[PDB]
Specification:
- Chain E: It comes from Oryctolagus cuniculus.
- Chain E: This is Small ribosomal subunit protein uS10.
- Chain E: GO terms for molecular function: RNA binding; structural constituent of ribosome.
- Chain E: Belongs to the universal ribosomal protein uS10 family.
- This is part of a larger assembly, with seven protein chains of seven kinds.
- Chain C is mainly α.
- Chain C has two domains: 78 residues, Helicase, Ruva Protein, domain 3 (Orthogonal Bundle); 65 residues, no CATH class.
- In chain C, strand 1 and strand 2 form a beta hairpin.
- The radius of gyration of chain C is 20 Å and the shape is elongated.
- By secondary structure, chain D is of the alpha+beta class.
- Chain D has one domain: Ribosomal Protein S14/S29 (30s Ribosomal Protein S14, Chain N), CATH 4.10.830.
- Helices cover 27% and strands 11% of the residues of chain D.
- The longest helix of chain D is centred in the last third of the chain and has 11 residues.
- Chain D starts with a helix and ends with a strand.
- The longest helix of chain E is centred in the first third of the chain and has 17 residues.
- Chain E is α+β, with helices and mostly antiparallel strands.
- Chain E has a four-stranded antiparallel sheet.
- Classes of the chains: A mainly alpha, B alpha+beta, C mainly alpha, D alpha+beta, E alpha+beta, F mainly alpha, G mainly alpha.
- The structure holds one RNA strand.
RNA sequence: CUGGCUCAGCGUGUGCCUACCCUACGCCGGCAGGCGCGGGUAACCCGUUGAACCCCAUUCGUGAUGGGGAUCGGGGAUUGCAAUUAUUCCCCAUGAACGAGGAAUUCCCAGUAAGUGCGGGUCAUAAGCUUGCGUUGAUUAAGUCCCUGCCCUUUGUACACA
């Protein structure tokens, strides 16, 4: 068999975001169609279902490197704030988007409010992560 | 030509006021300015300004109140009055029409010159 | 599907705006003074329009429904923070302004500061930079 | 009131708050490692403090 | 019994003299001793302008001050190595002893 | 493959430099035939070590210029890979021989310079060495691709593929061959 | 001076020119077809994806920067 | 442009007077922040410093254009005793000259130029500066006195404050 690390992560996250959308019951907030993902970003995401992608992205980030709280999610989801006429600077992600994704995965049986802060990946989470890994690798076969 | 109104609220409503509503009404710079606390430390100055204003004569254009202060946000309780704003050199004898609300008293002066 | 369909509108005229039909809708409706990239994208997400179309492939019913959402901000759940005109100092109504309306708002406002004779208005009138910008070595193209 | 006026303007920050611990002027100070020294006084006294020119 | 002595000095070979002295002490008094753990050195770096005034060509001084740290652990009661640690105190090296 | 090393998907065997002058200072066959252009470096240390650097790595190195494209050898190698696909399709035969022929035909062999009797000065024509032939050929076809691609939909990988096909035939269309013949004209003008 | 007025959507006779001229081009890219037919690169790509999917052009190897096709092999 | 993926090295950190530290984690908020309880005077905690460029895939199509972000209106947050002459930061809005730059002219040859971001100093607020650190990584040269400087030897001198 295969695990999460044995397949191309570019196909994995789209497969898992689709897998969560086939459930289609992810406690998605209200202001999804009006919000900008970071105050370094300019426009709203091109795609309309960016929440399910980010939920699956956060999910596999907790899988690979667990014990990660909202502040490390704003760190990992950072880029350039090109300051117009002044030079560019590193800037963080929106705290609200990261927190609500983890609270969505907390309400669902995937992550858990972990001791030493942050969220772990629970055995049901890891199972669903490892099984779809096998499905994506068997698809790329 | 029609009698003007502040944000969306009549001047009579703004003149019959308790501070924490006008704190909500005007803009955020003036909000923290008055939320920052009492006026009996540095702004013992502004209670003198208040004392100077509410000691007005009979129905005439009240005596000009000179001030060594520029940073005063004009609330409705000091409007229709005359003031000497110290510019370093000149005490600017300016009159306070009711379009001065949420503006600085010191924002009514020029020092320099064009060519 | 990819052929220029029957009655494809090359030129549109809405709120006295020349929107070209060949533009993509989110950057097509962005043409008028008051509608930028962000406000164009949120209101075309509001109106149940596929943003993958050109600005001529749509029907006049889809035109009026995107025009209504445009002029109806809070009426379709666009929040207080997004609006380009929040808490007007005369009206006190939080709602977006468009081309000819905003021309009236800005002109009245800087002429209001001029007539109360607040420095911002005095710097506006004497024709200098308003926001404490150093003019000792900048602003020469506009001033000969 | 003289105890209202005299030394009354608050100085909890700015270069008005701090002075060179030797000569007592407020231009080009070193605050790293609690030095609190003007660059001229430090650069003079550096090798008693234990600083070396090696690089 | 886990007593820990942290030797800290600006001079390395004076630090190594005191360090090599305390191990000789622990071994000749028949005591379990974890060898000196060389903790990373810290470089107190200050870069100044060279001129007191302004009108010289732009030249900078680069003052450095290296600070070195060993720590040696011992499994023994307090008062034996107290007599050892009291022996061979140099002007340069700085000693701090904790018990648990 | 303990047999022979393709350049991604391009064959190195049966690729001969017909010109004997650019045989010694062109390194493509048998030993310098590698999978990638992108290697370590250590050619710039000494003088003639530049000669042995794989000619495809020399093309890559020269292709990136004008500030924005500085230290982007990963972007530059992907453009050369894509161009190598396009010159294979448009032409049919080996992309390595296309590049080799373009470089041989783009290399000048006489060019002017200011000479002695230093009393005043004089512009006399001289011969360029086989290394200088390579250097100027690769530079001129790289600036040929750059100047052609700048503000035109025809993408840079396709622009290089045009310039390589043109020069390899000995077109007179290619920027590299125009400039070469201009240098050899000015050489004839003052010899 | 010059201005390049490319189409945003297909004409009937330009669609004829595409589906008949393009399957004999030995090099078919969105840049080549946009130059020859006068179309925007978005439509040029959209047509190339439509023609590959319908099964006429032969794809070689695509990329986020460069998407390259060619003619279908006859013999 | 929007997503996704994936890699660093130098540092500094609770103040003498000195007030003033770096911050994980959690809930509220779109954002700037706010409110909670902890760690660390440090190879111990921030922290395995999940940096940018870059890399994989959508959107755009040669249009002063989804290039450019000056100038400007309004609102929103934070520091301070106080931001008007906008301190700093956020959001919607506004969409300027600029199509690679004449005379001239600066710096530089290998982990160098250049791109790219990250710390220190200033610091209540705090980088278009400087001072350090990695990251990606070339074209050209192994030469000459032509230009510009400087230093020699021969030579002439009525100059030696030359």
């Amino acid at each position: 068999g295969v695990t999460v690390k044995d397949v191309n992560q570019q196909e994995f996250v789209r497969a898992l975001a689709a897998f969560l959308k086939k459930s289609g019951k992810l406690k998605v907030p209200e202001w999804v169609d009006t919000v900008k993902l970071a105050k370094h970003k300019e426009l709203a995401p091109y795609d309309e279902n960016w929440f399910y992608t980010r939920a699956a992205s956060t999910a596999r980030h907790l899988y690979l490197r667990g014990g990660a709280g909202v502040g490390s999610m704003t760190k990992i989801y950072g880029g350039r704030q090109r300051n117009g006429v002044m030079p560019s600077h590193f800037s963080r992600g929106s705290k609200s988007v990261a927190r609500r994704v983890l609270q969505a995965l907390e309400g669902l049986k995937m992550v858990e409010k972990d001791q030493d802060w942050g969220r772990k990946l629970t055995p049901q989470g890891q199972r669903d992560l490892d099984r779809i890994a096998g499905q994506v690798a068997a698809a790329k076969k | 030509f029609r009698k003007f109104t502040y944000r969306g609220v009549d001047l009579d409503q703004l003149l019959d006021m308790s501070y924490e509503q006008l704190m909500q009404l005007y803009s955020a710079r003036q909000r923290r300015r008055l939320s920052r606390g009492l006026r009996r430390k540095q702004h013992s100055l502004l209670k003198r300004l208040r004392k100077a204003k509410k000691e007005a004569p009979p129905m005439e254009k009240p005596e000009v109140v000179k001030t060594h202060l520029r940073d005063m946000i004009i609330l409705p309780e000091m409007v229709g009055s005359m003031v000497g704003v110290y510019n370093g050199k000149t005490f600017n004898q300016v009159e306070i029409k009711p379009e001065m609300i949420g503006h600085y008293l010191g924002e009514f002066s020029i020092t320099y010159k064009p060519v | 599907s990819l052929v220029i369909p029957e009655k494809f509108q090359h030129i549109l005229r809405v709120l006295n705006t020349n929107i070209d039909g060949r533009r993509k809708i989110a950057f097509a409706i962005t043409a008028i003074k008051g509608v930028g990239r962000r406000y164009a994208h949120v209101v075309l997400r509001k109106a149940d329009i596929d943003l993958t179309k050109r600005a001529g492939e749509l029907t006049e019913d889809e035109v009026e429904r995107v025009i209504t959402i445009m002029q109806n901000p809070r009426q379709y759940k666009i929040p207080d923070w997004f609006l380009n005109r929040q808490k007007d100092v005369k009206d006190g109504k939080y709602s977006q302004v468009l081309a000819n309306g905003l021309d009236n708002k800005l002109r009245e406002d800087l002429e209001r500061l001029k007539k109360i004779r607040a420095h911002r208005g005095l710097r506006h009138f004497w024709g200098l930079r308003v926001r404490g910008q150093h003019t000792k070595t900048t602003g020469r193209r506009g001033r000969t | 009131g003289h105890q209202q006026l005299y030394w009354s303007h608050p100085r909890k920050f700015g270069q008005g708050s701090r002075s060179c611990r030797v000569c007592s002027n407020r231009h080009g100070l070193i605050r790293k490692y609690g030095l609190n020294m003007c660059r001229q006084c430090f650069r003079q006294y550096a090798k008693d403090i234990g600083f070396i020119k090696l690089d | 019994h886990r007593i820990r002595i942290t030797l800290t000095s600006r001079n390395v070979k004076s630090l190594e003299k005191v360090c090599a002295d305390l191990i000789r002490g622990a071994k000749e008094k028949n005591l379990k001793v974890k060898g000196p753990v060389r903790m990373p050195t810290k470089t107190l770096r200050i870069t100044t302008r060279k001129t007191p005034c302004g009108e010289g060509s732009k030249t900078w001084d680069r003052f450095q001050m290296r600070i070195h740290k060993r720590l040696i652990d011992l499994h023994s009661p307090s008062e034996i190595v107290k007599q050892i640690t009291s022996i061979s105190i140099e002007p340069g090296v700085e000693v701090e002893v904790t018990i648990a | 493959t303990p047999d022979i090393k393709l350049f991604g998907k391009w064959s190195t065997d049966d690729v001969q430099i017909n010109d004997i002058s650019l045989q010694d200072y062109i390194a493509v066959k048998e030993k310098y035939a590698k999978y990638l252009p992108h290697s370590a470096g250590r050619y710039a240390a000494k003088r003639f070590r530049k000669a042995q650097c794989p000619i495809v790595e020399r093309l890559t190195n020269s292709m990136m210029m004008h500030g924005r494209n500085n230290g982007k050898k990963l972007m530059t190698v992907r453009i050369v890979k894509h161009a190598f696909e396009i010159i294979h399709l448009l032409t049919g035969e080996n992309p390595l021989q296309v590049l080799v022929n373009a470089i041989i035909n783009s290399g000048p062999r006489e060019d002017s310079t200011r000479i002695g009797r230093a009393g005043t000065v004089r512009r006399q024509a001289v011969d360029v060495s086989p290394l200088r032939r390579v250097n100027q050929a690769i530079w001129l076809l790289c600036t040929g691709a750059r100047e052609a691609a700048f503000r035109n939909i025809k993408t840079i990988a396709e622009c290089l593929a045009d310039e390589l096909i043109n020069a390899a035939k000995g077109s007179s269309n290619s920027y590299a061959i125009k400039k070469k013949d201009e240098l050899e004209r000015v050489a004839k003008s003052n010899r | 001076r010059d201005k390049l007025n490319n189409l945003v959507l297909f004409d009937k006779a330009t669609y004829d020119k595409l589906c008949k001229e393009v399957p004999n081009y030995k090099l078919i890219t969105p840049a080549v077809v946009s130059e020859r037919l006068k179309i925007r690169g978005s439509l040029a790509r959209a047509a190339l994806q439509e023609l590959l999917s319908k099964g006429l052009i032969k794809l070689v190897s695509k990329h986020r920067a460069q998407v390259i096709y060619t003619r279908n092999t006859k013999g």
